Amino acid sequence: PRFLKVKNWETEVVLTDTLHLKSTLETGCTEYICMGSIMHPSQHARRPEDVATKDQLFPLAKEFIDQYYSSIKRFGSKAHMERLEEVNKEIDTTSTYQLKDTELIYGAKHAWRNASRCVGRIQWSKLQVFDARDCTTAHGMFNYICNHVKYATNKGNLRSAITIFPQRTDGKHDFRVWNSQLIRYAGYKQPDGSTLGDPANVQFTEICIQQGWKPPRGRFDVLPLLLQANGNDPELFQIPPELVLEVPIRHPKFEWFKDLGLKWYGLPAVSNMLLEIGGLEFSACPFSGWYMGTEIGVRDYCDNSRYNILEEVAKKMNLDMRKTSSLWKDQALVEINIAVLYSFQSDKVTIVDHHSATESFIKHMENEYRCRGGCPADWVWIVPPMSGSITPVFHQEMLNYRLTPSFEYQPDPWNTHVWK
Amino acid sequence: RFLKVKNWETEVVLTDTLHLKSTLETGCTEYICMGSIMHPSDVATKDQLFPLAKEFIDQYYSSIKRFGSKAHMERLEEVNKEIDTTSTYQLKDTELIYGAKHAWRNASRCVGRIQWSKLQVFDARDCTTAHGMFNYICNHVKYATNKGNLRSAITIFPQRTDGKHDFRVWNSQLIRYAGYKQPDGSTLGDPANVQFTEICIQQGWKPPRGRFDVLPLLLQANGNDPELFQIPPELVLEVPIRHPKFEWFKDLGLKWYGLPAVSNMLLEIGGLEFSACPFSGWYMGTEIGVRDYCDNSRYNILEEVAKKMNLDMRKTSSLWKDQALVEINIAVLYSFQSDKVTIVDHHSATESFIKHMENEYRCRGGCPADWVWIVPPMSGSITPVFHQEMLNYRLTPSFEYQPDPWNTHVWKLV
Ligand code: HEM
Ligand code: HEM
Ligand SMILES: CCN(CC)CCc1cc(F)c(F)c(CCc2cc(C)cc(N)n2)c1
Ligand SMILES: CCN(CC)CCc1cc(F)c(F)c(CCc2cc(C)cc(N)n2)c1
Ligand SMILES: C[C@H](O)[C@H](O)[C@H]1CNc2nc(N)[nH]c(=O)c2N1
Numbered sequence: 073p074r075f076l077k078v079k080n081w082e083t084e085v086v087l088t089d090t091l092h093l094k095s096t097l098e099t100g101c102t103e104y105i106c107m108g109s110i111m112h113p114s115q116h117a118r119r120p121e122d123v124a125t126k127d128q129l130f131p132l133a134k135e136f137i138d139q140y141y142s143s144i145k146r147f148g149s150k151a152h153m154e155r156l157e158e159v160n161k162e163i164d165t166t167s168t169y170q171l172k173d174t175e176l177i178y179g180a181k182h183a184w185r186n187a188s189r190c191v192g193r194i195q196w197s198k199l200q201v202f203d204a205r206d207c208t209t210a211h212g213m214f215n216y217i218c219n220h221v222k223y224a225t226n227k228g229n230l231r232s233a234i235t236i237f238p239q240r241t242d243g244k245h246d247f248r249v250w251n252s253q254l255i256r257y258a259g260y261k262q263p264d265g266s267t268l269g270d271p272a273n274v275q276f277t278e279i280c281i282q283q284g285w286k287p288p289r290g291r292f293d294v295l296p297l298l299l300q301a302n303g304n305d306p307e308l309f310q311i312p313p314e315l316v317l318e319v320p321i322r323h324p325k326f327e328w329f330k331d332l333g334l335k336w337y338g339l340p341a342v343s344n345m346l347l348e349i350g351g352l353e354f355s356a357c358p359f360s361g362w363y364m365g366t367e368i369g370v371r372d373y374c375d376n377s378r379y380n381i382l383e384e385v386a387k388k389m390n391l392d393m394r395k396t397s398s399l400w401k402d403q404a405l406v407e408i409n410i411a412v413l414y415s416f417q418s419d420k421v422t423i424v425d426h427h428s429a430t431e432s433f434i435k436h437m438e439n440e441y442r443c444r445g446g447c448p449a450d451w452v453w454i455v456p457p458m459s460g461s462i463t464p465v466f467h468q469e470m471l472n473y474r475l476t477p478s479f480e481y482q483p484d485p486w487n488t489h490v491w492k
Numbered sequence: 493r494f495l496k497v498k499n500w501e502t503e504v505v506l507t508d509t510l511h512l513k514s515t516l517e518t519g520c521t522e523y524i525c526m527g528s529i530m531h532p533s534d535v536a537t538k539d540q541l542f543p544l545a546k547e548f549i550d551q552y553y554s555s556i557k558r559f560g561s562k563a564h565m566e567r568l569e570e571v572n573k574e575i576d577t578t579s580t581y582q583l584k585d586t587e588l589i590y591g592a593k594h595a596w597r598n599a600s601r602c603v604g605r606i607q608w609s610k611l612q613v614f615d616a617r618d619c620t621t622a623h624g625m626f627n628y629i630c631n632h633v634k635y636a637t638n639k640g641n642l643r644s645a646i647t648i649f650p651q652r653t654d655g656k657h658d659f660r661v662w663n664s665q666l667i668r669y670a671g672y673k674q675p676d677g678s679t680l681g682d683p684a685n686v687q688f689t690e691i692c693i694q695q696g697w698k699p700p701r702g703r704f705d706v707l708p709l710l711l712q713a714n715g716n717d718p719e720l721f722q723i724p725p726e727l728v729l730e731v732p733i734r735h736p737k738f739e740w741f742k743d744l745g746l747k748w749y750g751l752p753a754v755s756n757m758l759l760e761i762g763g764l765e766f767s768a769c770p771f772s773g774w775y776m777g778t779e780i781g782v783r784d785y786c787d788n789s790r791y792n793i794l795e796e797v798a799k800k801m802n803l804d805m806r807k808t809s810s811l812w813k814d815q816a817l818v819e820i821n822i823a824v825l826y827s828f829q830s831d832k833v834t835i836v837d838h839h840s841a842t843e844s845f846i847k848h849m850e851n852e853y854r855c856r857g858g859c860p861a862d863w864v865w866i867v868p869p870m871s872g873s874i875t876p877v878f879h880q881e882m883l884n885y886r887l888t889p890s891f892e893y894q895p896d897p898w899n900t901h902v903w904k905l906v
């Protein structure tokens with residue numbers, strides 16, 4: 073039938089999903105095969121890669137404008153029918169169209185709202201949108217990003233924000249932030265074959281060096297920005313450090329902890345994803361919010377191809393690291409995440425633990441099913457990477473489907489950029 | 493067609509061709525994923541049974557390099573004779589053992605499948621009464637427990653006939669502790685089991701009304717009223733739960749049974765339905781340490797453990813819950829290993845399953861897997877499966893869920 077129930081097996085709440093009937097693009101799954109643990113399951117875009125014909129772009133534009141005007145209790149109004157014919161002539165005469173300030177804000181907010189993988193979405197409508205569509209150079213991108221960071225950091229009282237550079241036009245004039253996130257630490261391939269800093273960014277850190285960045289070759293070296301405007305070669309910019317809020321990691325009991333010389337930055341800011349609205353593609357749209365403690369303390373510190381400080385922390389803890397069954401990783405993991413939370417909170421840097429976040433997300437689910445007929449959600453990603461079953465989401469059935477507007481992954485620019 | 497899955501921690505990339513052999517539905521659509529739905533959702537006619545039988549027989553004779561052979565073709569013919577004359581058919585012992593092993597191998601939710609081929613199959617298809625079932629299961633338990641050196645085993649009771657003569661183990665698992673709701677709303681024992689405990693008590697069981705009462709087997713044979721039987725106490729191997737560092741942990745009075753034995757599922761081989769097929773392995777620690785003890789609607793000992801740990805329970809962000817969950821799980825592992833009862837920690841088990849998965853891709857062309865279930869319920873990202881992409885599809889033979897027998901049985905006595 074035309075309904076799909078999700079059940080929470082810890083509370084027996086059953087929600088009834090009709091919103092999935094609006095899903096537009098494929099999840100990757102078939103009746104015969106589920107792909108819910110595939111990181112990039114589908115390539116079902118809504119258009120061909122480079123500027124699409126009218127009969128391609130306009131149907132997507134019409135659908136979005138239709139949604140925007142429906143959202144605001146119009147549809148068929150004078151302004152809706154005018155906007156349609158304005159988008160028509162704009163596509164006719166430029167092969168694209170330009171979003172209104174209102175529609176741009178609506179779209180950004182809803183792409184966040186539709187981010188199935190985001191546990192933080194209860195905040196979705198409280199997003200600050202910086203319109204950077206007038207930007208024309210990497211210097212201008214740098215100014216816009218600096219302001220983003222300064223506004224978003226707000227001295228630790230972090231604030232959600234997105235800065236939207238111009239939409240893709242022909243595909244050779246992309247605006248891109250080459251950094252995956254606005255603030256990452258460098259990773260250094262060492263002579264022996266080990267790795268100093270953040271191993272995830274070894275490749276990006278080398279592009280930076282290979283572009284003239286002079287690496288301090290330390291553990292927590294903030295990477296420069298590598299900004300690409302209107303398709304041109306990317307340019308390095310050093311973020312003013314007074315804008316990169318950093319928290320030294322200490323522990324509320326293990327005083328030897330701060331002597332591990334660990335710190336992390338306060339602002340998570342995804343800068344390599346693509347924001348899609350009415351078939352328009354915003355290839356540079358850095359968006360930031362605030363950390364769930366597990367992202368630093370479980371993934372950034374404890375993944376094997378990341379900082380991998382589990383080994384160290386357990387040593388100092390005097391744990392039996394002979395076998396796995398002492399749970400020495402699990403014990404050290406918990407202590408590390410206590411430290412991360414405690415440090416952020418002591419410095420009044422906005423952070424949320426995985427209990428509070430997951431609980432917020434269940435509330436948001438309820439809110440969404442009540443007012444929207446559903447809420448797309450990716451269990452594989454919503455469930456935090458430690459203490460899964462002692463959080464409310466583990467026991468929460470989630471329907472996952474693709475609504476638009478949305479954030480999409482996109483090739484890393486260096487796989488695609490022909491240099492000049 | 494092919495399909496690739498990536499491990500994002502190691503970058504290993506396996507290629508799945510075996511998904512082509514799936515048929516049963518995942519419940520996902522092309523536009524919705526149901527990968528976190530627990531149950532995404534009565535007797536086959538002759539026409540339905542023919543191709544299901546054929547497919548299984550074909551697959552069995554393929555697995556033993558006798559496809560197209562004379563013995564293969566007579567078997568197919570023999571099966572068809574039965575489905576005509578008797579509207580069903582009877583597995584050979586070879587086929588039953590193979591089918592049971594492959595239902596395990598095909599169990600996408602099971603992290604323990606590296607052991608699938610070492611499965612001790614007990615053919616109980618001659619059983620006719622609940623007493624026979626009691627006997628078969630006692631022997632199952634005694635064999636699988638093996639004084640703490642646990643052995644995988646399944647006991648398979650007569651397949652479904654018309655649906656009106658089903659064999660069922662009414663117990664969800666062979667060994668479970670009873671739960672009793674109190675007038676005041678509190679719960680003694682295992683809160684997950686209060687319903688079944690009521691049913692047993694209703695059937696004449698005199699409960700000791702303690703924290704760790706092993707429930708009685710409630711056995712149904714041939715569609716008759718189920719009957720109560722008390723597992724001989726000396727067959728229930730049990731581990732008192734102590735902690736290697738906290739001398740006070742033993743004062744929690746905690747124990748758990750050593751033998752995990754699922755009895756509420758249905759084994760499907762070649763379209764035949766084995767509604768009673770209890771199977772057993774050994775525990776991953778977190779099944780006891782994270783879920784049995786720490787699920788809020790289970791034994792919920794995080795409160796007590798945290799208190800005796802002095803943890804600050806005012807703010808979640810102290811991670812008292814997290815920190816106490818670990819110590820509970822250390823205790824569970826230490827307790828079993830000390831008593832030389834088989835158990836596997838989540839790290840060892842996920843590691844073995846990655847090697848198994850890779851091997852299954854190598855020799856079989858894939859390994860369906862339910863990431864939502866394969867990832868342990870604690871410390872997920874620090875185990876290799878977390879970073880391992882996985883394809884979920886339904887291969888037959890398979891273990892399937894089935895309705896609880898008290899929601900479908902129509903009673904015979906009085
Ligand atoms: C405000 C606090 C926020 C929190 C606590 C939060 C939390 C998270 C977490 C934990 C993830 C998974 C992270 C990972 O392991 O990679 C995630 C993913 C995501 N978030 Fe949020 N988020 C927040 C704000 C935002 C904002 C402001 C946006 C967009 C404007 C957003 C959009 C997304 C998207 C698109 C993903 C998917 C990323 C991917 O697929 O790689 N989030 N979020
Ligand atoms: C030998 C050691 C084994 C280990 C360590 C093991 C471990 C596990 C775990 C942790 C689960 C998840 C269950 C949950 O968390 O609720 C599971 C599920 C499952 N196991 Fe295994 N298992 C083992 C043996 C077996 C055997 C012998 C069979 C059958 C012959 C089997 C069939 C299954 C099935 C069908 C499921 C799915 C449960 C469901 O769909 O609800 N397993 N196993
Ligand atoms: C495949 C996943 N990988 C590759 C991109 C992610 C690695 C990574 C690196 C980061 F610096 C980082 F912040 C994240 C978390 C994303 C996030 C975004 C927002 C807006 C808020 C929040 N709290 N978290 C993930
Ligand atoms: C989905 C319903 N589940 C969770 C609510 C019931 C709880 C429960 C109770 C058990 F006694 C139990 F063994 C399991 C795990 C199943 C299993 C089977 C085998 C062969 C080995 C093993 N190690 N584990 C789950
Ligand atoms: C809602 C969700 O599907 C449900 O809690 C599942 C998640 N994954 C699981 N994984 C295992 N191993 N055991 C479980 O009981 C569950 N429960």
Ligand SMILES: C[C@H](O)[C@H](O)[C@H]1CNc2nc(N)[nH]c(=O)c2N1
Nearest residue numbers: 109110111452453878879880881
């Ligand atoms: C293979 C698996 O899909 C992959 O490791 C996913 C699992 N879930 C995740 N969940 C979050 N939040 N972030 C991640 O990077 C991942 N990785």
Ligand SMILES: [Zn+2]
Nearest residue numbers: 101106520525
């Ligand atoms: Zn799916």
